Amino acid sequence: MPESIDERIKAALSKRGIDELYTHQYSAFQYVQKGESIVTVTPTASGKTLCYNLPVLQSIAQDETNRALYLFPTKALAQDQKSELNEIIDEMGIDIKSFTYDGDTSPAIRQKVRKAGHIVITNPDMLHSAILPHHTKWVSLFENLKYIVIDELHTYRGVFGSHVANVIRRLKRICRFYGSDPVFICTSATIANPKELGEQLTGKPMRLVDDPSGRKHFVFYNPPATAEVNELAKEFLKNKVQTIVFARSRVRVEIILSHIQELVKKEIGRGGYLPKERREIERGLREGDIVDIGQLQVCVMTGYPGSVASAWQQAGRAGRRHGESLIMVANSTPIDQYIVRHPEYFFNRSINPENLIILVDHLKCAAYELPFRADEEFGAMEVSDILEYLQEEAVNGERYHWASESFPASNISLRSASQENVVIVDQSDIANVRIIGEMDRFSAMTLLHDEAIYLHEGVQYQVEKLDWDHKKAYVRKVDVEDANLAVQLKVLEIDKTKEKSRTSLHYGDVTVNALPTIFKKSGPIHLPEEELHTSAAWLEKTLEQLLLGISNVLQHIVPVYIMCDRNDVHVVKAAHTGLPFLYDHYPGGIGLAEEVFKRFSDINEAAKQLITHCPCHDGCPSCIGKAKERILQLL
Ligand SMILES: [Zn+2]
């Protein structure tokens, strides 16, 4: 082992015993010390937090005047990582103070951690809202902000991805002023474009790290869900096999765990969780009867968790050292049945800051937190003439307010393009009236319309009311367990066009309108409407029905490859070109069309194979809702 690494760290890691010269940790540390940003796809069982901890703590131990900044999604994960690294600081013995700076920290120590904390953990919302606008009170952080750590990079996508990219633009701008360009260390999971997603974020050409421990078994069956998973778990427990099941929604967890718990507890005799009891359960699991919290012997799932990365991660939570283990049951849903009938995405792998509205919002924010100068750029967005129409307002531009409640950041809620959008309030029980979700204008028109069928994470809901003039959905949770809208459209421009074999493929910008019309399951509804300018990638009555079938195929195939919500983008003679339309949901380009521009060839090939190998008769209700081969030979 090279003696370049600090011997304090070497001995502290030799105490626990993980001194193995490992592959991905080596490739990460070497080329992070070299100065190149990295993105890793290593699982939790292999490397986990150490791959980004080790270079950070090495730089902290070398020069005491070094600071690190972490991006973790929630306050619970912030506290978890803080405790995990505080344990290693304790084993190291070096006077290093690392804390979290989020909404639930004691104010008596906030100034302290601003003046003396080495590592600072903070979620993007709190970061953007408080830390960067008051970067003055963070001088000591930004003068020596060497590294920037990001956990779960795939969560930063869509509107959240664009907003976080703009926040990191502001962050790098502040660092440029304070003279401390940081190298970026991003962690993620199994996605199709890990390096391509890491490059566009910060505009840095970071490298991706892909790299016996036995072999893990895979299950590909479907019973003709809760009770069946319970029976599988009870078989494993009768055989005395360490088993883990994965229910996501807390309510489903409580129900299934009540079943399993009464049974097994009579046999054997998340968010709201705290780090003390978390470490107690870790102790129990890894050195008792029932973060390296422990290693499981078999993994049981509960449907496709709506993410390629999340499924692989929850599968990788289990594993042994030089041993074998086993890995999912679908439900009465075409999406889970589809991911069952499509295991071809497992042998290997299976967004746009150019949105001008978010650009204007973050321009206002940056102008508040740091004055601009038009004489330098790396190649990002900074056209000064556009940066100069932001002027006064006689009778939205800037708000030169001398009051205190008004703010430039104000309503710029980056979690879901919440310029002005709806907030969801659960009216099931008054005691703890749970305010849960938030949704854009058009997204709420599509989903949260009054008296709808809302499904929020395996739990059924029912919309009671929607205050549209103040954007507030009031819903009711149901245990007894569709929608529609259509109107005209207009076009703008095309920045990417084709002419291949009569079938021209265009990508550009358009402007659409809205109208709720009716909803399915059988009722009409009206709501005030507004236009929407965004990017879009696109290409007698029997032909209209054929195009409707094509639209069904696309609506059921596109969310898979783009890995987004099913109700993000929406599929549509056209007056633009005289003959007969994917468009982005949220105002402005969000990559949901440029990714289609990139991968439309493979999308069309997969559509061919899907419409051919569908277990039906020339079209299934889950794919179309000899027309099959006619569609095939037309496309
Ligand atoms: Zn079919």
PDB file of all heavy atoms in Angstrom, residues 261-284:
ATOM      1  N   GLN A 261     -46.084  -9.678  11.360  1.00  0.00           N
ATOM      2  CA  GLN A 261     -45.567  -9.482  12.703  1.00  0.00           C
ATOM      3  C   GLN A 261     -46.380 -10.258  13.721  1.00  0.00           C
ATOM      4  O   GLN A 261     -45.809 -10.953  14.559  1.00  0.00           O
ATOM      5  CB  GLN A 261     -45.552  -7.992  13.050  1.00  0.00           C
ATOM      6  CG  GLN A 261     -44.961  -7.686  14.417  1.00  0.00           C
ATOM      7  CD  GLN A 261     -44.899  -6.200  14.707  1.00  0.00           C
ATOM      8  OE1 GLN A 261     -45.332  -5.380  13.897  1.00  0.00           O
ATOM      9  NE2 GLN A 261     -44.358  -5.845  15.866  1.00  0.00           N
ATOM     10  N   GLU A 262     -47.710 -10.166  13.669  1.00  0.00           N
ATOM     11  CA  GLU A 262     -48.499 -10.991  14.575  1.00  0.00           C
ATOM     12  C   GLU A 262     -48.139 -12.463  14.393  1.00  0.00           C
ATOM     13  O   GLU A 262     -47.806 -13.154  15.368  1.00  0.00           O
ATOM     14  CB  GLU A 262     -50.000 -10.729  14.380  1.00  0.00           C
ATOM     15  CG  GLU A 262     -50.652 -11.320  13.141  1.00  0.00           C
ATOM     16  CD  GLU A 262     -51.386 -12.613  13.437  1.00  0.00           C
ATOM     17  OE1 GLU A 262     -51.495 -12.975  14.628  1.00  0.00           O
ATOM     18  OE2 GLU A 262     -51.859 -13.264  12.482  1.00  0.00           O
ATOM     19  N   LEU A 263     -48.072 -12.925  13.136  1.00  0.00           N
ATOM     20  CA  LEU A 263     -47.780 -14.337  12.890  1.00  0.00           C
ATOM     21  C   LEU A 263     -46.409 -14.733  13.441  1.00  0.00           C
ATOM     22  O   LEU A 263     -46.294 -15.630  14.288  1.00  0.00           O
ATOM     23  CB  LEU A 263     -47.871 -14.634  11.392  1.00  0.00           C
ATOM     24  CG  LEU A 263     -49.281 -14.668  10.797  1.00  0.00           C
ATOM     25  CD1 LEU A 263     -49.227 -14.811   9.284  1.00  0.00           C
ATOM     26  CD2 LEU A 263     -50.090 -15.799  11.414  1.00  0.00           C
ATOM     27  N   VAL A 264     -45.354 -14.057  12.985  1.00  0.00           N
ATOM     28  CA  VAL A 264     -43.995 -14.476  13.311  1.00  0.00           C
ATOM     29  C   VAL A 264     -43.673 -14.196  14.776  1.00  0.00           C
ATOM     30  O   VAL A 264     -43.025 -15.010  15.443  1.00  0.00           O
ATOM     31  CB  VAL A 264     -42.998 -13.791  12.360  1.00  0.00           C
ATOM     32  CG1 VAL A 264     -41.573 -14.180  12.703  1.00  0.00           C
ATOM     33  CG2 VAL A 264     -43.318 -14.160  10.921  1.00  0.00           C
ATOM     34  N   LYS A 265     -44.102 -13.044  15.299  1.00  0.00           N
ATOM     35  CA  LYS A 265     -43.884 -12.729  16.705  1.00  0.00           C
ATOM     36  C   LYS A 265     -44.549 -13.756  17.610  1.00  0.00           C
ATOM     37  O   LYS A 265     -44.012 -14.091  18.672  1.00  0.00           O
ATOM     38  CB  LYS A 265     -44.407 -11.325  17.010  1.00  0.00           C
ATOM     39  CG  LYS A 265     -44.112 -10.837  18.418  1.00  0.00           C
ATOM     40  CD  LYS A 265     -42.642 -10.493  18.589  1.00  0.00           C
ATOM     41  CE  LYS A 265     -42.240  -9.345  17.678  1.00  0.00           C
ATOM     42  NZ  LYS A 265     -40.817  -8.954  17.870  1.00  0.00           N
ATOM     43  N   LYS A 266     -45.719 -14.276  17.214  1.00  0.00           N
ATOM     44  CA  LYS A 266     -46.253 -15.413  17.952  1.00  0.00           C
ATOM     45  C   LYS A 266     -45.459 -16.684  17.677  1.00  0.00           C
ATOM     46  O   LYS A 266     -45.482 -17.605  18.501  1.00  0.00           O
ATOM     47  CB  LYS A 266     -47.732 -15.619  17.619  1.00  0.00           C
ATOM     48  CG  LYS A 266     -48.022 -16.802  16.711  1.00  0.00           C
ATOM     49  CD  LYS A 266     -49.508 -16.912  16.420  1.00  0.00           C
ATOM     50  CE  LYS A 266     -50.037 -15.627  15.806  1.00  0.00           C
ATOM     51  NZ  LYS A 266     -51.494 -15.699  15.509  1.00  0.00           N
ATOM     52  N   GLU A 267     -44.747 -16.747  16.547  1.00  0.00           N
ATOM     53  CA  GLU A 267     -43.913 -17.912  16.261  1.00  0.00           C
ATOM     54  C   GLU A 267     -42.530 -17.792  16.899  1.00  0.00           C
ATOM     55  O   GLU A 267     -42.027 -18.765  17.472  1.00  0.00           O
ATOM     56  CB  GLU A 267     -43.792 -18.109  14.748  1.00  0.00           C
ATOM     57  CG  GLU A 267     -43.391 -19.519  14.315  1.00  0.00           C
ATOM     58  CD  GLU A 267     -41.888 -19.718  14.234  1.00  0.00           C
ATOM     59  OE1 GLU A 267     -41.143 -18.730  14.393  1.00  0.00           O
ATOM     60  OE2 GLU A 267     -41.450 -20.866  14.005  1.00  0.00           O
ATOM     61  N   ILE A 268     -41.896 -16.615  16.812  1.00  0.00           N
ATOM     62  CA  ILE A 268     -40.547 -16.438  17.350  1.00  0.00           C
ATOM     63  C   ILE A 268     -40.541 -15.912  18.778  1.00  0.00           C
ATOM     64  O   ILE A 268     -39.461 -15.762  19.366  1.00  0.00           O
ATOM     65  CB  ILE A 268     -39.695 -15.487  16.482  1.00  0.00           C
ATOM     66  CG1 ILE A 268     -40.256 -14.062  16.524  1.00  0.00           C
ATOM     67  CG2 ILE A 268     -39.594 -16.004  15.057  1.00  0.00           C
ATOM     68  CD1 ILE A 268     -39.454 -13.061  15.718  1.00  0.00           C
ATOM     69  N   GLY A 269     -41.703 -15.621  19.353  1.00  0.00           N
ATOM     70  CA  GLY A 269     -41.767 -15.112  20.711  1.00  0.00           C
ATOM     71  C   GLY A 269     -41.575 -13.610  20.801  1.00  0.00           C
ATOM     72  O   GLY A 269     -40.765 -13.033  20.075  1.00  0.00           O
ATOM     73  N   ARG A 270     -37.313   3.984   7.587  1.00  0.00           N
ATOM     74  CA  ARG A 270     -38.119   4.888   6.777  1.00  0.00           C
ATOM     75  C   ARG A 270     -37.941   6.336   7.223  1.00  0.00           C
ATOM     76  O   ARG A 270     -36.947   6.681   7.863  1.00  0.00           O
ATOM     77  CB  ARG A 270     -39.596   4.490   6.838  1.00  0.00           C
ATOM     78  CG  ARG A 270     -40.164   4.394   8.246  1.00  0.00           C
ATOM     79  CD  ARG A 270     -41.609   3.923   8.219  1.00  0.00           C
ATOM     80  NE  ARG A 270     -42.204   3.890   9.552  1.00  0.00           N
ATOM     81  CZ  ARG A 270     -42.842   4.914  10.110  1.00  0.00           C
ATOM     82  NH1 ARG A 270     -42.968   6.057   9.450  1.00  0.00           N
ATOM     83  NH2 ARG A 270     -43.353   4.795  11.327  1.00  0.00           N
ATOM     84  N   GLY A 271     -38.917   7.179   6.882  1.00  0.00           N
ATOM     85  CA  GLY A 271     -38.794   8.597   7.182  1.00  0.00           C
ATOM     86  C   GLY A 271     -38.868   8.897   8.669  1.00  0.00           C
ATOM     87  O   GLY A 271     -38.005   9.587   9.219  1.00  0.00           O
ATOM     88  N   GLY A 272     -39.898   8.385   9.340  1.00  0.00           N
ATOM     89  CA  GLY A 272     -40.101   8.696  10.741  1.00  0.00           C
ATOM     90  C   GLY A 272     -39.155   8.010  11.700  1.00  0.00           C
ATOM     91  O   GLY A 272     -39.354   8.105  12.916  1.00  0.00           O
ATOM     92  N   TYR A 273     -38.136   7.323  11.194  1.00  0.00           N
ATOM     93  CA  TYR A 273     -37.194   6.608  12.039  1.00  0.00           C
ATOM     94  C   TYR A 273     -35.989   7.484  12.363  1.00  0.00           C
ATOM     95  O   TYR A 273     -35.598   8.354  11.580  1.00  0.00           O
ATOM     96  CB  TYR A 273     -36.743   5.312  11.364  1.00  0.00           C
ATOM     97  CG  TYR A 273     -37.800   4.227  11.360  1.00  0.00           C
ATOM     98  CD1 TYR A 273     -37.637   3.072  10.605  1.00  0.00           C
ATOM     99  CD2 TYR A 273     -38.957   4.353  12.119  1.00  0.00           C
ATOM    100  CE1 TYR A 273     -38.599   2.078  10.600  1.00  0.00           C
ATOM    101  CE2 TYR A 273     -39.924   3.365  12.121  1.00  0.00           C
ATOM    102  CZ  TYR A 273     -39.740   2.230  11.360  1.00  0.00           C
ATOM    103  OH  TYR A 273     -40.698   1.242  11.357  1.00  0.00           O
ATOM    104  N   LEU A 274     -35.406   7.242  13.530  1.00  0.00           N
ATOM    105  CA  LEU A 274     -34.327   8.045  14.079  1.00  0.00           C
ATOM    106  C   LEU A 274     -32.997   7.301  14.013  1.00  0.00           C
ATOM    107  O   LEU A 274     -32.964   6.066  13.968  1.00  0.00           O
ATOM    108  CB  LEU A 274     -34.639   8.426  15.534  1.00  0.00           C
ATOM    109  CG  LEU A 274     -35.299   9.789  15.763  1.00  0.00           C
ATOM    110  CD1 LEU A 274     -36.566   9.953  14.932  1.00  0.00           C
ATOM    111  CD2 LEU A 274     -35.599   9.988  17.241  1.00  0.00           C
ATOM    112  N   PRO A 275     -31.872   8.026  14.002  1.00  0.00           N
ATOM    113  CA  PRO A 275     -30.575   7.349  13.828  1.00  0.00           C
ATOM    114  C   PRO A 275     -30.175   6.468  15.000  1.00  0.00           C
ATOM    115  O   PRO A 275     -29.462   5.480  14.789  1.00  0.00           O
ATOM    116  CB  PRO A 275     -29.595   8.516  13.639  1.00  0.00           C
ATOM    117  CG  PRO A 275     -30.259   9.676  14.300  1.00  0.00           C
ATOM    118  CD  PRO A 275     -31.724   9.491  14.046  1.00  0.00           C
ATOM    119  N   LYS A 276     -30.600   6.787  16.224  1.00  0.00           N
ATOM    120  CA  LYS A 276     -30.246   5.953  17.370  1.00  0.00           C
ATOM    121  C   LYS A 276     -30.858   4.563  17.241  1.00  0.00           C
ATOM    122  O   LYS A 276     -30.154   3.545  17.299  1.00  0.00           O
ATOM    123  CB  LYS A 276     -30.697   6.627  18.667  1.00  0.00           C
ATOM    124  CG  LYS A 276     -30.454   5.793  19.917  1.00  0.00           C
ATOM    125  CD  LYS A 276     -28.979   5.460  20.081  1.00  0.00           C
ATOM    126  CE  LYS A 276     -28.722   4.679  21.361  1.00  0.00           C
ATOM    127  NZ  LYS A 276     -29.523   3.426  21.429  1.00  0.00           N
ATOM    128  N   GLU A 277     -32.179   4.501  17.061  1.00  0.00           N
ATOM    129  CA  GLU A 277     -32.824   3.212  16.850  1.00  0.00           C
ATOM    130  C   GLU A 277     -32.386   2.583  15.534  1.00  0.00           C
ATOM    131  O   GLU A 277     -32.388   1.355  15.408  1.00  0.00           O
ATOM    132  CB  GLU A 277     -34.346   3.368  16.905  1.00  0.00           C
ATOM    133  CG  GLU A 277     -34.958   4.121  15.734  1.00  0.00           C
ATOM    134  CD  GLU A 277     -35.298   3.209  14.571  1.00  0.00           C
ATOM    135  OE1 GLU A 277     -35.754   2.073  14.819  1.00  0.00           O
ATOM    136  OE2 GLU A 277     -35.095   3.621  13.412  1.00  0.00           O
ATOM    137  N   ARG A 278     -31.993   3.400  14.553  1.00  0.00           N
ATOM    138  CA  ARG A 278     -31.454   2.854  13.311  1.00  0.00           C
ATOM    139  C   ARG A 278     -30.182   2.058  13.574  1.00  0.00           C
ATOM    140  O   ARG A 278     -30.044   0.918  13.117  1.00  0.00           O
ATOM    141  CB  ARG A 278     -31.194   3.978  12.305  1.00  0.00           C
ATOM    142  CG  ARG A 278     -32.357   4.236  11.359  1.00  0.00           C
ATOM    143  CD  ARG A 278     -32.029   5.301  10.321  1.00  0.00           C
ATOM    144  NE  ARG A 278     -32.077   6.652  10.872  1.00  0.00           N
ATOM    145  CZ  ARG A 278     -32.008   7.759  10.139  1.00  0.00           C
ATOM    146  NH1 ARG A 278     -31.890   7.676   8.820  1.00  0.00           N
ATOM    147  NH2 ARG A 278     -32.061   8.949  10.721  1.00  0.00           N
ATOM    148  N   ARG A 279     -29.243   2.640  14.324  1.00  0.00           N
ATOM    149  CA  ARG A 279     -28.018   1.922  14.660  1.00  0.00           C
ATOM    150  C   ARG A 279     -28.295   0.747  15.587  1.00  0.00           C
ATOM    151  O   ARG A 279     -27.589  -0.265  15.529  1.00  0.00           O
ATOM    152  CB  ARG A 279     -26.998   2.873  15.292  1.00  0.00           C
ATOM    153  CG  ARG A 279     -26.078   3.564  14.290  1.00  0.00           C
ATOM    154  CD  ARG A 279     -26.862   4.421  13.313  1.00  0.00           C
ATOM    155  NE  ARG A 279     -26.026   4.979  12.256  1.00  0.00           N
ATOM    156  CZ  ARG A 279     -26.497   5.682  11.233  1.00  0.00           C
ATOM    157  NH1 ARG A 279     -27.799   5.913  11.129  1.00  0.00           N
ATOM    158  NH2 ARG A 279     -25.669   6.156  10.312  1.00  0.00           N
ATOM    159  N   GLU A 280     -29.320   0.854  16.437  1.00  0.00           N
ATOM    160  CA  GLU A 280     -29.697  -0.285  17.269  1.00  0.00           C
ATOM    161  C   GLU A 280     -30.179  -1.454  16.414  1.00  0.00           C
ATOM    162  O   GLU A 280     -29.809  -2.610  16.656  1.00  0.00           O
ATOM    163  CB  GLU A 280     -30.773   0.132  18.272  1.00  0.00           C
ATOM    164  CG  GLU A 280     -30.725  -0.629  19.587  1.00  0.00           C
ATOM    165  CD  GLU A 280     -29.522  -0.254  20.433  1.00  0.00           C
ATOM    166  OE1 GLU A 280     -28.952   0.836  20.212  1.00  0.00           O
ATOM    167  OE2 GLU A 280     -29.145  -1.050  21.319  1.00  0.00           O
ATOM    168  N   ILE A 281     -31.000  -1.168  15.400  1.00  0.00           N
ATOM    169  CA  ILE A 281     -31.462  -2.213  14.492  1.00  0.00           C
ATOM    170  C   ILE A 281     -30.308  -2.747  13.651  1.00  0.00           C
ATOM    171  O   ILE A 281     -30.270  -3.938  13.326  1.00  0.00           O
ATOM    172  CB  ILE A 281     -32.613  -1.685  13.613  1.00  0.00           C
ATOM    173  CG1 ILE A 281     -33.829  -1.345  14.477  1.00  0.00           C
ATOM    174  CG2 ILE A 281     -32.998  -2.702  12.548  1.00  0.00           C
ATOM    175  CD1 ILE A 281     -35.040  -0.911  13.680  1.00  0.00           C
ATOM    176  N   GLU A 282     -29.353  -1.887  13.286  1.00  0.00           N
ATOM    177  CA  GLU A 282     -28.160  -2.358  12.586  1.00  0.00           C
ATOM    178  C   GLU A 282     -27.388  -3.353  13.443  1.00  0.00           C
ATOM    179  O   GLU A 282     -26.974  -4.418  12.965  1.00  0.00           O
ATOM    180  CB  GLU A 282     -27.265  -1.176  12.209  1.00  0.00           C
ATOM    181  CG  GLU A 282     -27.885  -0.197  11.231  1.00  0.00           C
ATOM    182  CD  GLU A 282     -27.016   1.025  11.002  1.00  0.00           C
ATOM    183  OE1 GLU A 282     -25.775   0.882  10.993  1.00  0.00           O
ATOM    184  OE2 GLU A 282     -27.574   2.130  10.840  1.00  0.00           O
ATOM    185  N   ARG A 283     -27.168  -3.005  14.714  1.00  0.00           N
ATOM    186  CA  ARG A 283     -26.527  -3.922  15.651  1.00  0.00           C
ATOM    187  C   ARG A 283     -27.286  -5.238  15.719  1.00  0.00           C
ATOM    188  O   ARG A 283     -26.691  -6.316  15.621  1.00  0.00           O
ATOM    189  CB  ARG A 283     -26.437  -3.272  17.036  1.00  0.00           C
ATOM    190  CG  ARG A 283     -25.612  -4.038  18.078  1.00  0.00           C
ATOM    191  CD  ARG A 283     -26.421  -5.117  18.797  1.00  0.00           C
ATOM    192  NE  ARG A 283     -27.670  -4.600  19.349  1.00  0.00           N
ATOM    193  CZ  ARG A 283     -28.674  -5.365  19.770  1.00  0.00           C
ATOM    194  NH1 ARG A 283     -28.580  -6.685  19.695  1.00  0.00           N
ATOM    195  NH2 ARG A 283     -29.774  -4.810  20.259  1.00  0.00           N
ATOM    196  N   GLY A 284     -28.606  -5.167  15.902  1.00  0.00           N
ATOM    197  CA  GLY A 284     -29.399  -6.386  15.970  1.00  0.00           C
ATOM    198  C   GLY A 284     -29.235  -7.252  14.735  1.00  0.00           C
ATOM    199  O   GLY A 284     -28.954  -8.448  14.833  1.00  0.00           O
TER     200      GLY A 284
END
